[model samples]
Target: IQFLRTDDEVVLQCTATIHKEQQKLCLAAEGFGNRLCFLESTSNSKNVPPDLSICTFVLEQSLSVHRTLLYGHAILLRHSYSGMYLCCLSTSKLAFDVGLQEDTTGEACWWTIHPASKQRSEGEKVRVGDDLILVSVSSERYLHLSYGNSSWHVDAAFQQTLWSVAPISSGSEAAQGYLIGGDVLRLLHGHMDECLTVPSGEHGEEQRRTVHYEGGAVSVHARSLWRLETLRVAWSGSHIRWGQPFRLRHVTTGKYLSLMKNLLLMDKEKADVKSTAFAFRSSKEGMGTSEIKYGDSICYIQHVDTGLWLTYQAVDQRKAIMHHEGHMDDGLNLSRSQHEESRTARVIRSTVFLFNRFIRGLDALSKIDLPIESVSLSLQDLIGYFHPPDEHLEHEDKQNRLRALKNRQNLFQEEGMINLVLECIDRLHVYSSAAHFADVAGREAGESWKSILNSLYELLAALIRG
Candidate 1:
């Protein structure tokens, strides 16, 4: 609340960490009318309600007598779209569903924000991260989700009543204005069209190839995210500096961005040229002042070893990003325009991306609760025990996958893992169908196992990688 103001637009979010799977659940009024519900994410908050409808609310100081809202003063959550105040639906219900009412006169419309974790009184200032317990003045009940697990209603009293008040788009820029150590980030190729990106690697073998992926043009997206690992000092209180040396690690692949020194004999284009690499483009990974916060957050990165800086010079159809350590003695100098295009954009990693495997691990482990493990055999014996009828192999796999997805449609969507899982299943479907129709002979039927195994293994590795 240190930065929260009376007129500033904000959102009221409640807990979503069901079983430690992190999520942001926003309080939003249903489009139809009075009843309210929790929207899964802020990005999708606009979709559930009317078109172009945002679930943000404007905070209004209820008492005009007071110049500004004090810590304990009365406040109103005015829906930014309808401009209606939040109220307990009816007094007869005692505990009622939260509804929007236009009238500002009733005590039901007034809510007092109290600290959820501390003993701080209404006199102290409010800060952004402090969990709040929004109390209704009419019935003195804590705002809670109703029986539907999705409804916005009042509870006589509840411990999960804690609410987090945040700006419209919570983490992107408001709180993360300054660059800090251990920050997950993205590089907007100054023009903002090209965001530095890394390939989402597959399993172990393919992961190595992905780490050595050649340069290509990319835009600002989830794949382009990177993390800054501070060297020497692990200072939590201090923010990042312009010229401080740091390692840029790709978020998904768990690898560091490096300057490849040994691609000489291996590289064809220029035997002596160096490429901006990832992971084992390793060894030669010292980087210098691309950290300079030049005008409007500019960071023209220069390789600490060769003094060769990263540039946006168009090389091929893909606009390949590369640099040579030496031997560019010709009249070739970088354009000022190219140097001005590198940007350091902070990546808002909500759940650290490990959450996918955590949830998957939990679900996968749930099936193995038989309680008999004294027969824990060797790896080969364990592998030997699990043999399904080849004829019906794809049968149960397909049904189980679809069934698993059925219960987690919203869960996977919220975690951003749905598409990848669906793609794998679809590919597996193609191979299994091919295997089924293979002409009676064991030749093609046996051959198709490779195809299905490849897809099945690919799918299994992602879940296992975590």
Candidate 2:
């Protein structure tokens, strides 16, 4: 719900004048979950937080002050922070030129997105007067916010970009999701193919990400590193289901509490998640009238059977993990399985187990004043669980695979697992940013969710290496 902006110009000017060549500029969000916070310390000086300056975040006529904590860049600083950084554009109601004028001559504004291996060090600069010309440029162009108040607005008619113009009325409810500004042009190059949709100001093509939403049935445009263009359901629900209750037995207290469970791979079945025919009920006597809970877990037996098996089918086919049903009354009772590889027990064991060790590392992080959430999970912890380092990835034809990976055309093959990992990271960024915060830990669950995403990336990379 909150956005942070750092002055990029100050950081760049300081960097260009100071510091050794290989050293990175230091920046911190105090471990708060800021996806765009990575822009703070990058070479793009316009995005950095300026010293002792305040800019009114103007939307419509409403304005809020954005404060900067650090004014200039720091060099020769101790490197202790561990959170992965991703930079994206966060706009205020102002002209794009007003912001671009502050950067260096021919200075490019690019986002440093993580895990995107199609190109690790890649970025694009917005063209001069692109937004302005688009305002007066095309006739076939149509601008629509798509979500919330789903209506086409006059783009050539309005002189301001969506970032520059907030409606005079900040309605009680949320407004439209995306602001489609300017002339739409379908790019005539291989660069603007289906894989990558770059936002090229007003004269750009119909980029999928450009279509924003305010509310309603949420739809996700998931792109994977594998780049097979397969449709998989990541997340689109109000509650977390299909996850088994994993209990960690407290050694001292001899008590049990919820620990961790496997996150179902987002395939086709998840998208088909629908309401169960079985009804739920609650009582008032001892439970109280206000007290509420699902009637029974047993009622989910039928629905869970179908969904879980579908998930298992995917697991078996992909060879990711094995969940054998060699011995079971009906193959649906996953609880009785002694050595089921594809069950919740395996997932919790693989990924969630790392949270145990990660908790110990938090003290060190806290001493540094990073203050990340205790509930936060990472890829290291997950790797520590399922795919432990005791046994690494088996020996394969490394030289040949590495060659194929370097070649852009062969990226879709198994050799391109690195790119796949990055694609997962970027998709996680998009989903986590858009998702409503769940209050499982008294506060917004975004921080923990983001940590898990980074953990997934790290774990995948390590697995690929292994």
Candidate 3:
């Protein structure tokens, strides 16, 4: 399920700029053995060739923007227009211009991405629009595009060697259950768009320092370096299967949390052992509600396989100590004692109350007397009812309609929550459809439920406001 599988087609943009805008990498001509060049527009524009071709890049391994060279999967960039592939002209030569050839398969065409250390050395994050370096397997040289020149040639120097790599689409989803505790997750930074990594240290022992970067410096042996291991699973199956408990893996340290030691230390022999397993139960106890709490909710993570309850206690502003104490099976009792002050754990939870509350307010308003004409007002006016202008607040509706709304205080309360919920539902539909969640849940739980609720909210809001 993660996106960017091997052989998936991709487009690479060169961060080398012309007037501060990055250009797309492309073949100079639609012929065999053509030279590599930068195209201003990726798709065919008036100035560019109308026969725009997509570069089908075949990667060697699973995609990780930060794991370059060593995790270095061979990359083959094939031209869609000429059916030729990009390759270094010579294997023995120290430098050369990469050319497009008719060969479908060859070692000459393979390349590996190497990050530009200059930007990273200065403490800048690798962004989507930034430049990167490429190394060819055959020539063993860095690909370079000189200033004001179009063709890409191989060179030994790192100067002007960076090309931009950009994603044409969002990353693919991971398969279900792949996100369990103890499982390592490479969290791509939203702002920097780089993998979160702990830097390799001088003595080969990694320090606590973590940084974000694109592929190149991080190696395959550094697998544990960047992974965010899952620490606990909560009440729902979304965390993992119902009964199984999991632990968090700090990949960089290769250590596991040990209640016995009261510290996060490396345990090579028992690193993957089951003793690290921790069970998470609903922190909200005694209320006896089976309803799956979504959005902001909290739960107690317990080391139940043993006889302890693992709780996080704050030591300072930046440090939190994890301590395991109390009976594992005493979750319900613990919940009773700590129920009032437990923090809310936030996740996308159910929104049943908002919709139900909204519908009930509309039902009450339905019984009220209103102008028959305004009851079925225009769509624009209905939306405007929720987004009232300051001037219109005094005269948003006719005098007769305004007087009819005098007693409806609850109607105002429902409007804000319902408006937000509808917007949330709309965005979810745009990104993921019923087909996206087809196998995960049944039709009713998937798109069908969303559509039905969306319709319900729209109808109710329209009638009550209009």
Pick the TM-score winner: 1
TM for every model, in the order presented, reads 0.34, 0.18, 0.28
Order of the predicted models by TM-score, top scorer first = 1, 3, 2
> Clashes in candidate 1: how many?
9
Could you tell me the lDDT of residue 334 within candidate 1? 15
Predictions in order: lDDT = 0.43, 0.22, 0.38
Per-residue alpha-carbon lDDT of candidate 1 for residues 1-466, written as tens digits (9 for 90 to 100) = 2456666556677665544565656677532222343454432221121111235576777442113444666688776544577776574244566767768887878887777765666666666566777777786777875544444333434434777875432221222345544445555544434455433433332333232222243332334555554442212113555555555555444445555532211111221112322211111231111222312454555555555554443443222234653212211111111100111111112122222332343244334221111111111121221222245458778566444333223222332443544543443344344445243223443354354345434433433331
> Which candidate's lDDT is highest?
1
Q: Model 1: how far is 345 from its true place, Å?
A: 33
Q: Candidate 2, after superposition: displacement of residue 173 in Å?
A: 28
Q: Cα lDDT of model 1 overall?
A: 0.43
Q: How many residue pairs clash in all the candidates, one count each?
A: 9, 23, 17
- Residues 1-466 of candidate 3 have per-residue lDDT tens digits of 1223443334454444445565555323333112353343443221122112223232333223322222234566655333457677653223465666656465677776555664443222334444556677775776665543454433333344556553322213223323322223433322323332334333233343232233342322232132222321111112333234554444434444444434343443454434555555555231112332222223345564554554333233112224445333222211110111110000000122233343343344334222212222222222333342345554645553444332121222222334544543453454256665344334433545455445546644643563
List candidate 3 segments past 4 Å from native: 1-3, 17-29, 32-71, 91-94, 104-106, 117-131, 148-160, 169-466
